[PDB]
Every structure is written in C-alpha cells, then in structure tokens.
Amino acid sequence: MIGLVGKKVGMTRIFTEDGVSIPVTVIEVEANRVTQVKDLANDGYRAIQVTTGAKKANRVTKPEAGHFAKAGVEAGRGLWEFRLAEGEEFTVGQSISVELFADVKKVDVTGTSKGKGFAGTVKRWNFRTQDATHGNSLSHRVPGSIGQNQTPGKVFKGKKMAGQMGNERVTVQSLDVVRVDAERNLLLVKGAVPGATGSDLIVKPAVKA
Amino acid sequence: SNIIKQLEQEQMKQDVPSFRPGDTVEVKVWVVEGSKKRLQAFEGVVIAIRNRGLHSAFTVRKISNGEGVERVFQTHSPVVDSISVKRRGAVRKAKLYYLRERTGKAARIKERLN
Amino acid sequence: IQEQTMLNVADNSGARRVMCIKVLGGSHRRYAGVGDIIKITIKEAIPRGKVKKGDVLKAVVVRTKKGVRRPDGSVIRFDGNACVLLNNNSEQPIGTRIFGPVTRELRSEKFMKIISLAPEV
Amino acid sequence: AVQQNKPTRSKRGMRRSHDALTAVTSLSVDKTSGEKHLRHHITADGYYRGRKVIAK
Amino acid sequence: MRHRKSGRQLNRNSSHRQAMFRNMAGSLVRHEIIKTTLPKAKELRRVVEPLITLAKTDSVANRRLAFARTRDNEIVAKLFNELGPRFASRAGGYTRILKCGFRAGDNAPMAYIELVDRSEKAEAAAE
RNA sequence: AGGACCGAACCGACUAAUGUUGAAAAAUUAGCGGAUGACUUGUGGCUGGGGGUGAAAGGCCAAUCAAACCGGGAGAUAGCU
RNA sequence: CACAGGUGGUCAGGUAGAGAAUACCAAGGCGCUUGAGAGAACUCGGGUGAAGGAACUAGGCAAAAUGGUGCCGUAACUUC
RNA sequence: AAUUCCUUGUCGGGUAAGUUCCGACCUGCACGAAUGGCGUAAUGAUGGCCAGGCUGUCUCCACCCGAGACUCAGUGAAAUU
RNA sequence: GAUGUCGGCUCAUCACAUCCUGGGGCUGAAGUAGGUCCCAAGGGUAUGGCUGUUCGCCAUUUAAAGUGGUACGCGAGCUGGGUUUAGAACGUCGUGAGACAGUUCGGUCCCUAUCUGCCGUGGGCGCUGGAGAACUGAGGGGGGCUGCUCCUAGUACGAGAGGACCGGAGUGGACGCAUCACUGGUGUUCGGGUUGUCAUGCCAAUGGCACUGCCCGGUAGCUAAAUGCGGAAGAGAUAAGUGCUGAAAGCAUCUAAGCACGAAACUUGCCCCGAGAUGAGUUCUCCCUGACCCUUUAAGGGUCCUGAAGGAACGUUGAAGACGACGACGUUGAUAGGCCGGGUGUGUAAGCGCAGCGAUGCGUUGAGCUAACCGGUACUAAUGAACCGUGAGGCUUAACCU
Numbered sequence A: 001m002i003g004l005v006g007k008k009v010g011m012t013r014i015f016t017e018d019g020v021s022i023p024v025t026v027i028e029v030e031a032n033r034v035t036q037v038k039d040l041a042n043d044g045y046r047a048i049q050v051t052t053g054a055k056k057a058n059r060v061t062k063p064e065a066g067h068f069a070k071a072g073v074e075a076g077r078g079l080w081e082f083r084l085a086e087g088e089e090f091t092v093g094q095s096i097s098v099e100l101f102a103d104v105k106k107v108d109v110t111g112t113s114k115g116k117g118f119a120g121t122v123k124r125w126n127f128r129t130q131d132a133t134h135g136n137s138l139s140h141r142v143p144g145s146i147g148q149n150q151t152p153g154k155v156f157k158g159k160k161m162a163g164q165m166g167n168e169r170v171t172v173q174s175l176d177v178v179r180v181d182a183e184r185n186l187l188l189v190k191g192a193v194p195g196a197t198g199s200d201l202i203v204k205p206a207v208k209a
Numbered sequence B: 001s002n003i004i005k006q007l008e009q010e011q012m013k014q015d016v017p018s019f020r021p022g023d024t025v026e027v028k029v030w031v032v033e034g035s036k037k038r039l040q041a042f043e044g045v046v047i048a049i050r051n052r053g054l055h056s057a058f059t060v061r062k063i064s065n066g067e068g069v070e071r072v073f074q075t076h077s078p079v080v081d082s083i084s085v086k087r088r089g090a091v092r093k094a095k096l097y098y099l100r101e102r103t104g105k106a107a108r109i110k111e112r113l114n
Numbered sequence C: 001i002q003e004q005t006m007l008n009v010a011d012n013s014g015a016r017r018v019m020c021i022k023v024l025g026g027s028h029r030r031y032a033g034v035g036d037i038i039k040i041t042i043k044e045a046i047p048r049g050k051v052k053k054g055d056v057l058k059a060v061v062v063r064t065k066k067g068v069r070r071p072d073g074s075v076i077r078f079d080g081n082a083c084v085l086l087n088n089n090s091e092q093p094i095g096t097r098i099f100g101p102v103t104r105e106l107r108s109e110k111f112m113k114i115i116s117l118a119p120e121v
Numbered sequence D: 001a002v003q004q005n006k007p008t009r010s011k012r013g014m015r016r017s018h019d020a021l022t023a024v025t026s027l028s029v030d031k032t033s034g035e036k037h038l039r040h041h042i043t044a045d046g047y048y049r050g051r052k053v054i055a056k
Numbered sequence E: 001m002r003h004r005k006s007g008r009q010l011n012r013n014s015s016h017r018q019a020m021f022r023n024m025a026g027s028l029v030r031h032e033i034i035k036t037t038l039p040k041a042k043e044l045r046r047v048v049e050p051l052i053t054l055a056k057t058d059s060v061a062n063r064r065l066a067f068a069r070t071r072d073n074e075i076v077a078k079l080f081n082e083l084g085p086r087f088a089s090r091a092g093g094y095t096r097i098l099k100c101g102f103r104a105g106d107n108a109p110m111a112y113i114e115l116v117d118r119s120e121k122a123e124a125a126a127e
Numbered sequence F: 001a002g003g004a005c006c007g008a009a010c011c012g013a014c015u016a017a018u019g020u021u022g023a024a025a026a027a028u029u030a031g032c033g034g035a036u037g038a039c040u041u042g043u044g045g046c047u048g049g050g051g052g053u054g055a056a057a058g059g060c061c062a063a064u065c066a067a068a069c070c071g072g073g074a075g076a077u078a079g080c081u
Numbered sequence G: 001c002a003c004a005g006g007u008g009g010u011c012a013g014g015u016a017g018a019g020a021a022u023a024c025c026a027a028g029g030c031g032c033u034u035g036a037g038a039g040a041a042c043u044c045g046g047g048u049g050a051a052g053g054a055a056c057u058a059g060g061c062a063a064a065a066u067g068g069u070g071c072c073g074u075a076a077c078u079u080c
Numbered sequence H: 001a002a003u004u005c006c007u008u009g010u011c012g013g014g015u016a017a018g019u020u021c022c023g024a025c026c027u028g029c030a031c032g033a034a035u036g037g038c039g040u041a042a043u044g045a046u047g048g049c050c051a052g053g054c055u056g057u058c059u060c061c062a063c064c065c066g067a068g069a070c071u072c073a074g075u076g077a078a079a080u081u
Numbered sequence I: 001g002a003u004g005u006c007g008g009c010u011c012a013u014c015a016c017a018u019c020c021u022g023g024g025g026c027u028g029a030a031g032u033a034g035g036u037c038c039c040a041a042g043g044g045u046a047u048g049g050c051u052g053u054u055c056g057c058c059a060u061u062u063a064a065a066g067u068g069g070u071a072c073g074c075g076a077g078c079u080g081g082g083u084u085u086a087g088a089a090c091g092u093c094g095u096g097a098g099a100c101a102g103u104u105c106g107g108u109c110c111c112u113a114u115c116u117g118c119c120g121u122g123g124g125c126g127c128u129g130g131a132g133a134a135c136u137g138a139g140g141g142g143g144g145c146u147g148c149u150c151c152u153a154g155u156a157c158g159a160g161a162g163g164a165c166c167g168g169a170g171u172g173g174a175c176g177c178a179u180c181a182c183u184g185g186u187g188u189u190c191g192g193g194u195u196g197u198c199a200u201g202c203c204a205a206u207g208g209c210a211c212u213g214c215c216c217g218g219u220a221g222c223u224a225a226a227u228g229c230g231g232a233a234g235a236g237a238u239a240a241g242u243g244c245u246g247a248a249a250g251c252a253u254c255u256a257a258g259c260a261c262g263a264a265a266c267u268u269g270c271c272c273c274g275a276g277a278u279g280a281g282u283u284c285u286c287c288c289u290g291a292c293c294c295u296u297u298a299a300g301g302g303u304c305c306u307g308a309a310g311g312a313a314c315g316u317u318g319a320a321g322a323c324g325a326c327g328a329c330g331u332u333g334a335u336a337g338g339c340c341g342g343g344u345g346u347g348u349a350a351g352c353g354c355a356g357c358g359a360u361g362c363g364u365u366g367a368g369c370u371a372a373c374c375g376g377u378a379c380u381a382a383u384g385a386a387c388c389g390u391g392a393g394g395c396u397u398a399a400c401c402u
C-alpha cells in the first residue's frame, strides 16, 4: 500500500529549533505495478509492485520475462498490497513516490535488522551478568541454564541460549514523516529504520494507528 | 547522490560563523535561547573553545565558562540559538583543538599570540 | 544520580556535602537528573543554620556532570554536582539565598523560588 | 563427559555422511598439456595468457 | 558474529605485521616476482603501492619518508630514481597477484606477486 | 653495635587467577616474608622401625608413616561380598 | 618425555643507575620441531572507559592506588 | 570476653538504617591468679571494626590488543561402553 | 560397587489459596479512602544497614514490594560465608586418651559432552518434467506493567475538612526492538608529545625496543549513558455480577424456551516465523518436440546424437558470516585493491632563511602527514571455455476443445 526502496544514512533538520528531527531519507523511486493479483486466479486480492528499476542487465530469464505491457522496464524486488484499487500496470503506469499520506501521518518503515552474527546470552537478551569475586571459569558471561532437576529438562525451548542475532525484519512501526520531495524522491522519517547502507526497506502506510 | 543526497545537509548549515577558531574568544555566542511565555530575547556566553568539525552538525565549540562554576555548550551552528560570530580573545592555540585542561586559576592561554 | 554519590548545596543553612540515598520516582530508578527530587542526608553542615549532620530531607538536583541537552542537542554540563535542600512535606526550598547558576528545566512553576536566585539562566 | 554405551556402526558411518569431494574437473588448460588449475598455470612455466617470466 | 570494513588483516601482534612487511615490501623491490601467501600478498599491496607512489620528485622530504616506512637506503634509492618513474605516467595498479596454491609444507595458498620491469635504457617517446 | 631498618642474589611460601586427562604426581603469573643470622649452601660422616629424628604437626625417615621397604611364617583368618 | 620444575662453584663489558635492581645493548647465544587462514559465542592474559565511587561482597577478593633524592615538618603513647 | 546458654542482654557511640565493632553495666548458664591474673611500648604475610585515597568489585556493561575456540593440511589421545 | 548440605549468584518454569493493576456483590459504603467476599494468572511484583543466613528488624522507596511447587528448582553452571577431616584455643565434661546438637582463628569445590533436551545453523531427499520467483496461511512464538499532572470539576457528594465517577489530554519510572544523525566511550592499523637506550658514519632527520614504553587527541566501525518507536484502540464470545421476557408455580421469578449487557483472563487485532501444511497448497514467467536396439514387452533395460532454462564451481568480494548459508560483481565491469580529488583527525613537517652566546623563537605555514570514509577512475586482479541438470511430462475418471 506504498512503495518500497532502499534508504541511505540519516540526518538532522534544524529549523524552529527541533534538530531532534533525525531524518532517515530513504529514496523511493518509481513503483510500477508489474502484476495485479485478484480474487479469481492469483489467489487473494494483493497488487504487486516493484518500486525500483536498478539497471539489471544480467538477470535470469523468467524474471526478464516477468515484465509485459508498454515500456517493459526491469527492477528486482517485488512487493504488493491487498485491498485497494491500484491499476493494471506492468512496469509501466508508474505508481508514485508521493503516496497519499497528506503531510502529518505516521509511516511504518520495515527493513532487515543488521546482523551481529553468533551472539552470547549477554548481547542477545539483557538478562545475563555474573560477578568477578571468584570462579573465573564461569566469568561474567555463561548463564546458569534451565532450572528444574528431575523434570528431565524439556528445557522449555526458549530461555535465551546464545545464537546468532539474525537480520530478521523489524518494522519500527509509527514514525511521523517530515518531508517527501515529490520529484527528488527521498521522503524523510524520524530516526529508527533498521538495516544499514541501502537495505531494501518497505516503508508501509500507518497501520500502527 | 554524489551531490543529491548529502545535498540537503550542505543546503542547511549554510552559515558564516568565522571560518576559523583560535580559542579564548568570549564571544557572547548570543544564542536566541527563548525562555517561555513571551520574551524572545537572547543572551550569549563567555568562552574558551575546543570543538569538532563535521557531520553538517558541527555540534561543538565546547565553550568553557568560569562564572561561578563551570563550562559548556556543544553549540552546533544552526537556528534559535544564533549569532556566535564574535571573536574577542586572540589565540595561544599551542596544542590547538581538544585543549582539555579544565583547570581553575593562574592557568591562562596567553592569547594575543598574533 | 544513584544512591551514595556526593553533591553540594547551591543554597544554604547547614551546607556542604550531602549524600543521596534514594532516587525518587518509582521502582528501580537508576539515576536522578537536574530537576529531580532526591532523598539526601546532611553530611557536613556548618556550625549554624537549621540543618545538621545525619539529618535526612529531600532535595533537588540543580546542577550535575552528565549535563543537560535537548532541542538542537546543545549540551550544557557542569562538574558542579548541585543539590539545594527541600524541607520535607511542602517541597518549597529551605534556604535564604541560592549559590551558583541553575537551568531552564528547573524553570518549572513547581520550584520557582529556585530560578529567581543566583541571577543565572 | 563420556558415552554411556557404544555407538553402533550404523552410527559412525551415519556420522561420516559428509566425506565431501572436490575435483570439479573444471578448466585446467588453455595452452599447455592439460595442466594448470582454474587460475594459474604451472608456476615458473605457467602464465595466465602468456609465458610468465619462465615457460618451457 | 560480524564486523565490517576493518580493512587490512591480523596475523600476529600489532607490531609484527607492521614490522614484517618492512622486510617483505623492501624485498619485492630488490627483485620482480616474489612468493608469499595469497593473504599476505593482497596485503603487501597497501604497503608497496604507496611506496611506488611516494616517488615523484623526492625533494628529500620524501626520501626521508621512504627511508622511514622501509628503513633501507639500499632500496630507497631504487624507489625514486629507477623503480619510481617506470610508472611515473600511470596511476595505481603497480602490482600483480599471480596465484599458484599448494604449499606442501602446510598446504595453503601462495601467489607470486610481481610488477612489470625489464631493462634500463632511454629512448624518445613513441607510442 | 644490633637474632637493628629498606632492598637484589640466596632462603622461604601469606594472597588471587590459571592449571586440575596439567608444561608440572604441588607448578606458572602477579604480588608476599627473611635477607650478618636460632642465616644460607657444597662434600662426606652418624642415628634403623616399636626404632630413629622431631623449635611438636603424629611431622620427617627415598612420590610410602597412629609404626618404612623387601623376603619369609603364608594358601594368616574372613560366621562377609 | 627433546617435560615452562631441581642442580654447587667461577667470570662479570657500554649508556643510565645506589646497584650483581631495571631498561636498551657488546662479545656471544637464540626465535623455544605442527604450520596456513579466519577475525563468532565463550574461556585465558592485557589496554581504555561516560556519570557514580564499595551501592559489590562473607570480607574491598581482585583490581585501581602509593612509589625517587633533597629539604621543611610530624600526634597518642613510650621500656626514652 | 577466643569463656554468656537466654542473646541481636541493657545503656551509650558510630550509621539514614549496625545480629559485627568500640565504651559501660554485672544477671560470671559455665573468668580468675605460673594447666598463671590484670596491664603493656614495640613487633605481626595474625582475628574483628571504622576512615581517607583509589578504582569496572558494583549500578550496567562497551570497545580494543593478543593466546585458544572456528576452517584447511600433517600427526593423533582420554575416561566410559 | 557415592542421589554432594544451607545461604548467595545466574537463569528460571508452573500453581492460585491474587500482593499491584482489571471487573463485580454486601458494608456499621456521603465523598476520599477503606473492610470483606466473588471473578481474574495478561503483565508487573525495591535499593540498602546488621547477620552465613533463609527469615527477620531497621532506613528509604514503590502501583505493589504476593504464598507456594519445581531433589526446601538451579555445584558434569559459578561461589564456599554457614555446616563433619586433619592444626590450635576458651568455657564446660572427664583421673585421662579425648569430648560438646557450645564458642573461636585457619582450612585443595575435578570432568575435552556420546544420548535425550535446547539455542542457532547447513547437507540430503521428497513434494511426480525441470527451473526462477511472488504468495496464501494451517499452525507456532513474541508482546500484553504501570506513576504523576491537567481538563471534566474545586463540580456530584459535604457541616466543614475534603473531594470523585465517567471520558479525555500530556509527561514519566521499569522493560523490549531498532539505530549511530546528536551527546559520549573505545579506536595497540591516524597524527602528535616525551623518558631511557641501540642503531641508520656524523649534524640534522628518522627507526627498533622498554605495557601501544609513558602519555595527549582521534577516522570508520562497534557501541550506551545517546536517539527513535512499542506495549493501545477496536471486535467475538465470555467470568463474577447485573438484567429483560416468561412458565413450571394464574402471582412472582435472570432459566426451564428466548433474549441483553459484562474484565489486563479466552479468540482476534499488532510484530516475527511459517507449505516437510508428506493434508508437501496457489499464481506469474523460462527451457527441452534427434535416431535405433534386446528383452522375459506396456515394465522396461540399453547405445549414439544431444544437451536448454537453471544450478553449481572458480575468482573479486560484502554493513553477510564459526564453517556451510545468504547478498553484490566477473571486462556487456566499480567487486575488491591501487590511483585522483575532497572530507576528517592531528596540529604548523622536512629543508631553507633570520634573531638569540644558547635552550630556543619567528618566517616559509594553519604546514606536514592522514584509516576502514564520500565522489570518481579499469591501473592490478575478477579469462574463452569445462561440470551437473535433458530431449515435451503415469494410469483412471469428470468437464472443456479442432
């Protein structure tokens, strides 16, 4: 229900003396429907849209054929919405970078968390510690595992044993958008935004309510 | 992006502070401040200076006061905390920026080194 | 700012050092900032002034080392860890005058007596 | 600490189910006797495209 | 876990590497082609390249610096007078990484690493 | 002058970490105590098991000590496993 | 055991230093008989840490800390 | 109290708060005069308590430098069952 | 032929006889606050002083500081203060060796994980031609805390004192996720200062070593104390409770038919995983339409010619990572390194000139140097092929069709 393009760095807009404003400025070029899912066939509602167009000279055939209407055009990713009334485009019939959000609404940036990698019980969950007075073997690190005793230890498949942090999605949810820039598509948000450099990102509407 | 992303920054902090700091300048870095209810009014601050220079948010110029007790502001450069332009103290920038001495008396930065 | 810790007195009657012993404002308060009320214990005092060693009252934190900063992010910070006693059941400041510079977060209509003394911001 | 009872053979083999093998028999030569890996010929007689310092 | 562009690698203590390459790089100029390990190779670039590049007009200030990073007059001369101008016309890329692999002693990569050279003569420009 | 004072060699072992299938059947690392004295050490000699030696802990007497090691009485005895 | 332990005596260079400490070096002797990459959790040995400063804990355990020559100056008590 | 069971005795002190500590009291369960009594300057890697300094001991952990841990090539164990 | 004690740390999981918050009934319930009982386990549920303590008392917080089960949860996870070894002592007992359900000072805490279990993460094969993708959503998990203030309203209520309901508005404490733009920490790969000494022939200038020798400051990145956002509304069906209508029982009655409300509980709403969902689903797009033979012939077995879409392999690599995996790029090229420019950080190099007996100073000069950065540039390396994967897709039935 709104384009989705990569972000790049974050800034500050100081006027009237906020400066607190920590813009994310995540460029959102053209979208282009490319496909329109519907009731009969395609399954549910939905409405694909590849809000990109990065020159992809070398691409596998099926995707290179995945386009079909007027200009053709090619991108890479491929999202969609659901209920609405979006066009029947292909990578033709541009959507817009100025989705209908008026000027003061909260967006819902969605990206993939950075990736720490394998991480201890110390970093994964703030529950860990241990002291330094003695027994340096189990220093301020290793936990004291699943309690219980004779209960064979079904370990209750959780606690927080060390494991990689993941890159999993995040969806900050609720973020008032400050600027958009109709033609110089950037759209600034207020801090947050997961991932780095130029992760795909999604930037939904305002479902958070 | 070369000159189209970093471009908003470069088109905001677009001021003319003094293009050069040589400490000890008690510039009333007049900062609009504000107070509440009415009165805009602004009152600056005596100085010394140590800083940083970057991020389009050159959030710095530790101005270290001596009145009654002690120090600072990281007074960047933009908006409702204005004009800092003044230069009233000369120099003695010997170790130059990042002059962490934080001492209270006969310790001068012999300015007038011109 | 955390239990123990040592602040000053930017006012008077029984001065100098006074240790914090409780950060008020709900369970697990970690620290207290400028503007925050705190449980203090007179640990120095002057032979005179209605305030003496061992005495337990409440007190605000007028100035401190972590430093204040907001809007743009201008960070004033002192190395003058204030106080300024507070007679217990009425939170009015206990003391004739007040020493040192304060701030605009103390600018609240609640202390007030405090920001109209020691001519300073 | 220790195994409480002997791991069967159906177990040791079933544990070694990752012996792995290479030898993709990829491009070896482009101008010699079939030698050279997928990148450099026979050093001191190899070269990528042409005689590198020494050849025959 | 993961980190990011912490450019250059580790091997031994901080000082070792910044001490070994002094031996490595200086050795490269003495000859043409060497034989190290791929990892060491790609690393030897960042040290040898600025050396090749530091040579423009010496001016002593630089023959002083070159004598500092390599600490060896023997090769410091080559850097400026002979080795230097061989590429005085071209930007960077004065190093080749010709692989090999197979150590036998430990079974790890190798790579020669060299740089175009030939003989010392003088001519007039042509093309 | 001194069973005097600070402190290396040398002698000793108060503390913590590591080691605990060790580098090591008691150590390594950082500290620590004595250091002209009831000091410390080389070589050789003398005390023998109910015996020795002991500023005393049942400590030491060859990785063994509320009675050493080796061989013997010996296939001790074992209402126990 | 080609074992981070034990083993008596002799010799005693330069700069610095009270010095057979300690640091850098002479003469001289060595890199310690698996190596090459990687740059996770966690373990061992270290460096630096905002504000606080013993709240830790059985206990300030461990750390951090003090540290030199000269001179000023130094309490209870005392077998002086 | 290295002796007190009741016991965190009672009073005082230090503390915001002190089952420990220091000074008293005496009701000594169950001190006591060479199986020594009460003191005692000096000394103590001795037990207990307080303070200043100091700090990652801690609030609450962050980063970093190295030896392992991981991957490849060589050699190649262990208890247990 | 060994199931390690109490307390602490770490990290927990359940019950409900519920401490706080949520909803109700009665009250000797005006209000505010309470008392008690019913319902309710979503979430939440203190720092210290003393002591080995659990507990307890005390200081001060808090919405509150719940009771209990889990080998009085938790030592192949930490501690070793209490308590049973050997030393020594006091009181007391004993002629004594010694002893104490007394006290006191000192006193070695092992184990490289095979199986179950977990937290992560790959390799097979299967989903019936093989591929590249985008989904659906059966299921599964996470999350569910709450203070204060203002408006309502100084109103209802009240003699005053005091002071709501309902509903709304802002700002917090604790917790969770993300992220470095700010504030900062680090930053032994950047710059500088400086102590001792060896060397580069010497001056000068530099380098090695001494914790990075000591130290000052700091790029990127990582980071919290920094910054930004979230625990919601709204629905379904309820708990206790309250009710309508109404018999049995002419009335009455919340129940017997039927209807209506009703809580942080339950289902959903929000975030993540998610078709091995073997019940292996859906949609879109891409590729393969050459010949023969022997059988025991509908089962095949086999040879030559072919080998696509794609995958993988290798290489340059990455904000991705233990290894695998995953993303980008391979000359139709910015994927790494180098090189140009800029930024930044350090703080005005070296050399030369002049002043000063000299240390030293000034000028050249805000110089010199400068990383992981930004903009750009094919200079170096990413080679042409080769490998795997085929050759039009089983039977039965129903419907549609040249």
Ligand SMILES: [Mg+2]
Pocket: none
């Ligand atoms: Mg141990």
Ligand SMILES: [Mg+2]
Pocket: A152
């Ligand atoms: Mg079971």
Ligand SMILES: [Mg+2]
Pocket: E003, E004, E005, E006
């Ligand atoms: Mg890296």
Ligand SMILES: [Mg+2]
Pocket: F004
């Ligand atoms: Mg003596």
Ligand SMILES: [Mg+2]
Pocket: none
């Ligand atoms: Mg020692």
Ligand SMILES: [Mg+2]
Pocket: F007, F035
């Ligand atoms: Mg001595």
Ligand SMILES: [Mg+2]
Pocket: none
């Ligand atoms: Mg002898």
Ligand SMILES: [Mg+2]
Pocket: none
């Ligand atoms: Mg013996």
Ligand SMILES: [Mg+2]
Pocket: none
């Ligand atoms: Mg015998």
Ligand SMILES: [Mg+2]
Pocket: F073, F074
């Ligand atoms: Mg016989």
Ligand SMILES: [Mg+2]
Pocket: none
């Ligand atoms: Mg027998």
Ligand SMILES: [Mg+2]
Pocket: G002
């Ligand atoms: Mg050896």
Ligand SMILES: [Mg+2]
Pocket: G049
């Ligand atoms: Mg600190």
Ligand SMILES: [Mg+2]
Pocket: none
């Ligand atoms: Mg304590």
Ligand SMILES: [Mg+2]
Pocket: none
């Ligand atoms: Mg505690």
Ligand SMILES: [Mg+2]
Pocket: none
């Ligand atoms: Mg200590």
